[PDB]
Structure formats: structure tokens, C-alpha cells
């Protein structure tokens, strides 16, 4: 009875994911904003995959750390093989979806992780940011505005659907994301951005007095 096994695995994965904290991604005027609750400085849930590709995850740290390392290795190999412009968010999202589906199908215990991949336009180019959401069983969706993962996401989803404006500022977006997450100072918070105005490397980490000044 494959239906019973599939339902039990889905329930286990949902229970595992729902116990994790909430990480949210926003698309403001200058790129993509990542906000997460990280009480530990040593462990991080937001990282960098390539020049214009970001990474965010929620769930067991060891399960998505390996996925992040594999994605970084794959992006580096593909960039060195063809060119640096070959690597895009679509390919990383697709390979992550295939890997998650294979883990869900063949492995004994499914991964209790949620994945988000964000891409920004190259320097001197105009293009709307792209956000992708990968679900534990391999499902892939495209989110035009924002992605909310981890925990009770419904109240935060409603709080973000309301009072959301395009082409906002970094400070305004940061306050909106913080208010949505609360529905929280320098500590227990992790903020990273994908600045499209950077020449080559768009990933940038905000931590310290700069975050307090922005807040």
C-alpha cells in the first residue's frame, strides 16, 4: 500500500518542518532581502551559491548544510565548465528538486527541510528578481513577491500579504519583514541581502551596529 507509506512520510516531514523557526525572503527595489531568527552566530541558514544566486533554508541544520555544499559545488563546476553566466537560479532549483524527490522516494527517512533560491539581474541590466520554493517531496513553485518557510507560516503569510509594496526601500522592507515575523534586536536575527548594484558578487551580510542603525 504505497498510499499509506506516502502519507506517513509526508506527515513526518510536515511535523519535522513545523517545529523549525521561520525564515522569510522579500524582494525590494535593490534585490532580495533575507530575514531569519538565528540565536547562534556559529550556525547560519542563509548563504551564497554563486555571484547572483542566494540560498535560504529551514529545518535540521545538518540536512540542508549538505544540500548547500552540494549546490555550491555544482554551481562552481558548471561555471568553470561552460561560463560564469551559465549558472542561474533555475538550474539550482531543478537539481535541488530532483535531489529532494530522490531522497523522499528512495531514502528511509525524508528530509525535513524547506529550500528557497533567489536570483538577481546582472550589473547594468534590468530584470525582476526571481524566487523559487522547493518542497521536501520535490515540488517546485515560483513565487513572484515573497516566500515564507518554517513554523506557523499562515499568520506571517497574511501579515505579508497585507501592507506589502513593490519597489520599497531597504529599511522599509526590513521593518515590514520584522513586523511580519513577530506576528528581536541585533541578537537572534540574521539579515542578508542580494545587492544588484554590486559589480560581480551580489551577496552581502549585515551584522552588528549596521543592523541596529538600519533597524
Amino acid at each position: 500500500s504505497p498510499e499509506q507509506a506516502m502519507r506517513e512520510r509526508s506527515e513526518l516531514a510536515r511535523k519535522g518542518i513545523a517545529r523549525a523557526k521561520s525564515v522569510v525572503a522579500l524582494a525590494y527595489a535593490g534585490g532580495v532581502l533575507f530575514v531569519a531568527e538565528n540565536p547562534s552566530r556559529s550556525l547560519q541558514k542563509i548563504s551564497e551559491l554563486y555571484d547572483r544566486v542566494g540560498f535560504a533554508a529551514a529545518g535540521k541544520f545538518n540536512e540542508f548544510d549538505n544540500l548547500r555544499r552540494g549546490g555550491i559545488q555544482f554551481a562552481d563546476t558548471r561555471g568553470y565548465a561552460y561560463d560564469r553566466r551559465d549558472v542561474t537560479g533555475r538550474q539550482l532549483a531543478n537539481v535541488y528538486a530532483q535531489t529532494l524527490g530522490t531522497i523522499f522516494t528512495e531514502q528511509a527517512k525524508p528530509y525535513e527541510v524547506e529550500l528557497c533560491v533567489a536570483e538577481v539581474a546582472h550589473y547594468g541590466e534590468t530584470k525582476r528578481p526571481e524566487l523559487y520554493r522547493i518542497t521536501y517531496d520535490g515540488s517546485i513553485a515560483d513565487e513572484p513577491h515573497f516566500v515564507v518557510m518554517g513554523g506557523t507560516t499562515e499568520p506571517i503569510a497574511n501579515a505579508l500579504k497585507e501592507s506589502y509594496a513593490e519597489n520599497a526601500s531597504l529599511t522599509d522592507a526590513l521593518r515590514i519583514a520584522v513586523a511580519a515575523l513577530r506576528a528581536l534586536g541585533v541578537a537572534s536575527l540574521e539579515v542578508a541581502v542580494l545587492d544588484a548594484n554590486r559589480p560581480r558578487r551580489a551577496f552581502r551580510r549585515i551584522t552588528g551596529s549596521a543592523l541596529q542603525a538600519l533597524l
Binding site: 565548465a81 561552460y82 561560463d83 553566466r85 551559465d86 538550474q91
Partner: protein
């Protein structure tokens, strides 16, 4: 055999001879050594027809495979990288590459010439002309004096045909215009609208004019 490529404002031209020999005996009379492998790219190998046609077919298959898989054509930088992998794997005669860069900032300076050395390393020409083959030295020395007369596609084609004639005049392995059998060199012109083969009558008229002027 000799293949000559030179740049003109708004494009690039490529041409080659029609002779293949086994030492001191003539083997072929209408050998084709220049082929169109992409909408904005042509290649040429100084050697037998079979090797050149197989190389062109393999390059076209590789380019089309990437195009169909990813849905977007490769960048010019990525096209050179894949070609060098093919050259290194084979080792032999060395190829000559000419194409158009449609993403260049200046359309008038978009033509490109790529050459591979004996070791297999690729170089981008900056002097505006390049010749490969046994009669490459004579053709290059002729273009050195004749490059000041190139102002459009027709001038570049005339200069290329004259360079081929000069190369054939001093080398016994390169064939000149055959005014008895009616076999003239083949040429390819690449511009913003794409790579197109030059009709044989314009080649014939230019060769006849050059021969008459030389008398």
C-alpha cells in the same frame, strides 16, 4: 591549403582554398574547408574535407545540444571554451574560428577571430586578420599591406581573395583560381543578420578582376 579571415566594420569575412594533395600529387579539386556551424559562427580547418566536415558536424551538434537543453544559446565566451575542449580531446591540423558577438557594446567592433596554437591554447586576434595553413605566411604578409583598403564587406572580400591568390602564387600546395574548370574559393560572411555563404559568381568576378589587374 590556406584559410584567411579578416575583420571589416560591422562584420567579418572568411575564405579558404580548394586544393588537397598527398605530397606532390593533387588529390582533390573542389575541396570545401569552410563551414557554417551556427547562426553567428563559422569554422575552418586546413586539411582534408572529411576531417573538416566531421569537426563542423560535431561542433554544431554540441552547440545545438546545449541550445535545446537550456533553451538559450551559449555566450561567445562559452562557445570558445567548449571548442577548446574538443581540440584538446582530439590530440593534427588546427581550426580557425570566426563569429559575431551580438551582445557587444559596439556593433561595429563585434567581429571576432580565434586561433589555436600547436599546444591547443586559444588566442583572440587583435590585429584584424589571421591566416592558417601552409601558405599562411604569404597570405598574412599580403594582408599586412592590403588591410588599409578595407572599409566594408566588399572591400574585405576583395582583400581576402587577393590574399588567397598571393598565398597560392608562392605555395604549390595551395590552388589558385581555376579559369578552365570553373572552381573558385568559397567564402562566408557573418554580420548582424547572421552567417551567409557568398555566391560563386561574385567570387568568380572578383577573381577575374584580380587576375586581369595582375596582367
Amino acid at each position: 591549403a590556406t584559410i584567411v579571415a579578416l575583420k571589416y566594420p560591422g562584420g567579418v569575412v572568411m575564405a579558404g582554398d580548394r586544393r588537397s594533395t598527398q605530397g606532390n600529387m593533387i588529390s582533390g579539386r573542389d575541396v570545401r574547408k569552410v563551414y557554417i556551424t551556427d547562426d553567428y559562427t563559422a569554422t575552418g580547418i586546413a586539411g582534408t574535407a572529411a576531417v573538416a566536415v566531421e569537426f563542423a558536424r560535431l561542433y554544431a551538434v554540441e552547440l545545438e545540444h546545449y541550445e535545446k537543453l537550456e533553451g538559450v544559446p551559449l555566450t561567445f565566451a562559452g562557445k570558445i571554451n567548449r571548442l577548446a575542449i574538443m581540440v584538446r580531446g582530439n590530440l593534427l591540423a588546427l581550426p580557425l574560428l570566426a563569429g559575431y558577438d551580438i551582445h557587444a557594446s559596439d556593433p561595429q567592433s563585434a567581429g571576432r577571430i580565434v586561433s589555436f596554437d600547436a599546444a591547443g591554447g586559444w588566442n583572440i586576434e587583435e590585429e584584424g586578420y589571421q591566416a592558417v595553413g601552409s601558405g599562411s605566411l604569404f597570405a598574412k604578409s599580403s594582408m599586412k599591406k592590403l588591410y588599409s583598403q578595407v572599409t566594408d564587406g566588399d572591400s574585405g572580400l576583395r582583400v581576402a581573395v587577393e590574399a588567397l591568390y598571393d598565398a597560392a602564387d608562392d605555395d604549390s600546395a595551395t590552388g589558385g583560381p581555376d579559369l578552365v574548370r570553373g572552381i573558385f574559393p568559397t567564402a562566408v560572411i557573418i554580420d548582424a543578420d547572421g552567417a551567409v555563404d557568398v555566391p560563386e559568381s561574385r567570387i568568380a568576378e572578383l577573381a577575374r578582376a584580380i587576375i586581369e589587374s595582375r596582367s
